[PDB]
Write a protein that holds these residues in place. Structure first.
Motif: not given
Ligand SMILES: Cn1nc(C(=O)O)c2c1-c1nc(Nc3ccccc3)ncc1CC2
Lengths: 297, 258
Positions: A52-77
């Protein structure tokens, strides 16, 4: 969601985090996999906060969160991919040292990422060399926001969720009620010095040891240096009174500007500790440039 | 007063306009109603007192709920499941030590399964697309409190109280921004405790004038006056505690003289 996961080729573990490829676009990414059935308490609080916090912070010097995949057993960032972390780089640089111009470039960028965080009411809270990522172009980025907190409302200090000891700020050690943005500046100062000297500034063995190592270098704080210290919970009047070491002896390779900036980043009173915003204005960065590292990849 | 203070207020104002639920969502709900919502929120307040949770937590949950309901039809019998998942998520976000799932299933009195609750946590996350860092009335009050020249703890409690009250009644409050409800709550409390008014520093900071606040202020004053007559009472009970200086027992001004 399972279709999306099928689109990723795992390349190799880098951290769990895998280097991974997008089979359709060819894009290279870092996948942070999170198993959910290992706790049966739902999505973890760290994940909630990181996403929630990361996807609020777009900046060249902050690692970019490209996507989130939420199945039933796994969560991927899904993150952008970078080439290495600063801890490994510092290790590889032990013999040679990291060139002062690159140290300046890195500190400069880190302060920009951190300033962006703070002006969007995020505390990182876990700034340490392995959580900082660098690429071959000489860019460096803040990463690992598992401990990050929004401080629209003041953030209470927690015993278990704390930055590793060596980079922990004195307020925290002396048992302050709340975190402020200053604890991040402290950690950065610690990292700045470590890059300069090839050694950790305050490698404590314990809470009380960490505290004393700081006292031995910066002097034992008093009411004049830091109004309130003597009132803080874990302050003992029976602390040894050490004197403040001469700073040119603490970071010898540093010039006047560098010594100046570092001491403001390590100021005892968190109210007075320089801010990322202001640190960026410092004459130290007068001549900053963007060197590229020699990464032994 | 910090210096990211101004950047952050500006950012929160930026954000509060995006996290905003549909003001008319409730008449598009086939099965639930404002009254049912009021009961749900008042219950959440209770839960928060039981588990000693932060006010920010409560405020965040209400946000999640109102947003979820803006795009999902829910039946009477499921409304509480949504609220429970929302409370759990807000706890994970804001609390240092979130209660465990079990504790949340306990307070729904085994109306729902650990499974259902965790399944609903997932659904709410999907619907809200993991955007949980919402601006709250609470947050803006905190900002406004620094511009309190004589800092006064009864004023802070009373403002907290008034702001918390607005959580209960989707009509009218769903139609005001958090920063605005905050402004009203701050002024009304400040006026009741000390007779002072919405300060110059905050007019400059927020760009809100007493005049701009008036419509909301009128509503908040009405709610304040009627508070003892309201069907939901958990907040007044909560703000009788010594911790809040018993402010819910303070008599509201008869007129705001605006
Ligand atoms: C390791 N790691 N942990 C986290 C995290 O969020 O915990 C993250 C990463 C990471 N590492 C690398 N690159 C890299 C390549 C080689 C060696 C070290 C790092 N690139 C992106 C990320 C995204 C976030």
């Amino acid at each position: 969601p399972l279709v999306d996961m099928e689109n990723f080729q795992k390349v190799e573990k880098i951290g769990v985090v895998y280097k991974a490829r997008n089979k359709l676009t060819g894009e290279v990414v870092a996948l942070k996999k999170i198993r959910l059935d290992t706790e049966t308490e739902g999505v973890p609080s760290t994940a909630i906060r990181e996403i929630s916090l990361l996807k609020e912070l777009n900046h060249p010097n902050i690692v970019k969160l490209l996507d989130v995949i939420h199945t039933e057993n796994k969560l991927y960032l899904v993150f952008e991919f970078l080439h290495q972390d600063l801890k490994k780089f510092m290790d590889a640089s032990a013999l040679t040292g990291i060139p002062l111009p690159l140290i300046k470039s890195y500190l400069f960028q880190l302060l920009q990422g951190l300033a962006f965080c703070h002006s969007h009411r995020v505390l990182h809270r876990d700034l340490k060399p392995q959580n900082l990522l660098i690429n071959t172009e000489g860019a460096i980025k803040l990463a690992d926001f598992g401990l990050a907190r929004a401080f629209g409302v003041p953030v209470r200090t927690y015993t278990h969720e704390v930055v590793t000891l060596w980079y922990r700020a004195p307020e925290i050690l002396l048992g302050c009620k709340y975190y402020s943005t200053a604890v991040d500046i402290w950690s950065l100062g610690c990292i700045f010095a470590e890059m300069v000297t090839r050694r950790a500034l305050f490698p404590g063995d314990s809470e009380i040891d960490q505290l004393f190592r700081i006292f031995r270098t910066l002097g034992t704080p008093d009411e004049v240096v830091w109004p309130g210290v003597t009132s803080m919970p874990d302050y003992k009047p029976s602390f040894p009174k050490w004197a403040r070491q001469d700073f040119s002896k603490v970071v010898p390779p540093l010039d006047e500007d560098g010594r100046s900036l570092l001491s403001q980043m390590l100021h005892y009173d968190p109210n007075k500790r320089i801010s990322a915003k202001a640190a960026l204005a410092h004459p130290f960065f007068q001549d900053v440039t963007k060197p590229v590292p020699h990464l032994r990849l | 007063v910090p210096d990211y203070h101004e950047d952050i207020h500006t950012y929160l104002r930026e954000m509060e306009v995006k996290c905003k639920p549909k003001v008319g969502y409730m008449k598009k709900q086939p099965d639930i109603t404002n009254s049912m919502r009021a009961i749900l929120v008042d219950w959440l307040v209770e839960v928060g007192e039981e588990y000693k949770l932060q006010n920010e937590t409560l405020h965040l949950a209400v946000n999640y709920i109102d947003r979820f309901l803006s795009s999902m039809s829910v039946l009477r019998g499921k409304l509480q499941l949504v609220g429970t998942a929302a409370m759990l998520l807000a706890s994970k976000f804001e609390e240092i030590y979130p209660p465990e799932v079990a504790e949340f299933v306990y307070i729904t009195d085994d109306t729902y399964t650990k499974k259902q609750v965790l399944r609903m946590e997932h659904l709410v996350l999907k619907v809200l697309t993991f955007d949980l860092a919402a601006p709250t009335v609470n947050q803006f009050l905190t900002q406004y409190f620094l511009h309190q020249q004589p800092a006064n703890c009864k004023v802070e409690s009373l403002a907290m109280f008034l702001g918390e009250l607005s959580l209960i009644d989707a009509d009218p409050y769903l139609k005001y921004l958090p920063s605005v409800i905050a402004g009203a709550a701050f002024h009304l409390a400040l006026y009741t405790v000390t007779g002072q008014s919405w300060p110059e520093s905050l007019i400059r900071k927020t760009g809100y004038t007493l005049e701009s606040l008036k419509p909301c202020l009128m509503d908040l004053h009405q709610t304040y006056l009627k508070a003892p007559q309201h069907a939901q009472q958990s907040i007044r009970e909560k703000y009788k505690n010594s911790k809040y200086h018993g402010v819910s027992l303070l008599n509201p001004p008869e007129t705001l003289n605006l």
